C-alpha cells in the first residue's frame, strides 16, 4: 500500500494537543491539524468544553483568556464539530493547504486512513461508508460528517482522515465520534478553509 501521502500528513499536519484542566489529575490529549501560518483545526466539542484553563501545542502554552480568532463551521444552520483557531504571533506552521480537499466524492467502500498523534503517532483505517447529514451524539446533533467502519477510541478526535477520489488521496476530515464499531469524521472542504482563513486574516497569496 502506498503510504507516502499519509506519511507526509503525519510529518507536517497532525500534531498532539493537550488541554490542561483544574478538575482532573491529567491533561486531555488528542490531535490537531496544522493548516498554515498560525491557524489549526480542532474539534468544537473539545474547544468549547468549559473546563480547560490552558492548552499546549507545538511546544507552546496558551491560556483560555487569550484573544483567539476562531471560526465555528456550520451547515444549513446546524453546528459542525469543526473549529478553526488562529493563534497570536509566533513560529509559523507549514503551509499544508496542498494536502486538504477532494473535488470528487470517495467511492463506496474505499479506504479511509486516519493519521493520529493522540497516543504517540499511529495510523488507523477502515472502509468508507458514505456521507451523513448529521450524527446524533451524547452532546447533541452535529452536522456534515462521513463514516468509516473501524472501532475508534476516546482521544482519537482530531486525527486527519485521508480518503481517495479521482486518483488522488487528500485529507477531507477530522475524526469526531465513535458508535458501536463505526467512526464518524467531520468533513473538510478546501473552499471552506480558504473562506475561513480570509475571515481570520491569515495572509495568503492568491494564485492568478
Author numbering: 4 to 211
Could you pull the original sentences from the published paper?
Seneca virus A (SVA) is an emerging novel picornavirus that has recently been identified as the causative agent of many cases of porcine vesicular diseases in multiple countries. The full-length SVA genome is approximately 7.3 kb in length and contains a single open reading frame (ORF) encoding a single polyprotein that undergoes proteolytic processing and cleavage by the viral 3C protease (3Cpro) into four structural proteins (VP4-VP2-VP3-VP1) and eight non-structural proteins (L-2A-2B-2C-3A-3B-3C-3D). SVA 3Cpro is composed of two topologically equivalent antiparallel six-stranded β-barrel domains (A1-F1 and A2-F2). Three closely positioned residues (His48, Asp84 and Cys160) within the proteolytic active site of SVA 3Cpro comprise the canonical catalytic triad.
In the catalytically inactive C160A mutant structure, a phospholipid-like molecule could not be built due to lack of interpretable electron density data. In PV 3Cpro, the protease activity and RNA/lipid-binding are mutually regulated and the two sites are dynamically coupled. Similarly, we presumed that mutation of Cys160 may affect phospholipid-binding and partial phospholipids may be dynamically separated from the binding region; Therefore, the mutant could be used for phospholipid detection. As expected, the C160A mutant showed strong binding to cardiolipin (CL) as well as to phosphoinositol-4-phosphate (PI4P) and sulfatide, but displaying weak bindings to other categories of phospholipids, such as phosphatidic acid (PA), phosphatidylserine (PS) and phosphatidylethanolamine (PE). By quantitatively analyzing the intensities of the three positive spots, we demonstrated that the binding intensity to CL is 2-3-fold that of PI4P and sulfatide. Thus, CL is likely the dominant category of phospholipid that binds to SVA 3Cpro. In addition, the CL content in the C160A mutant was only ~40% of the wild-type, confirming that mutation of Cys160 affected lipid-binding and that the lipid could therefore not be modelled in C160A structure. The preferred binding of SVA 3Cpro to the CL may therefore explain the observation that a portion of C160A mutant can traffic to the mitochondria.
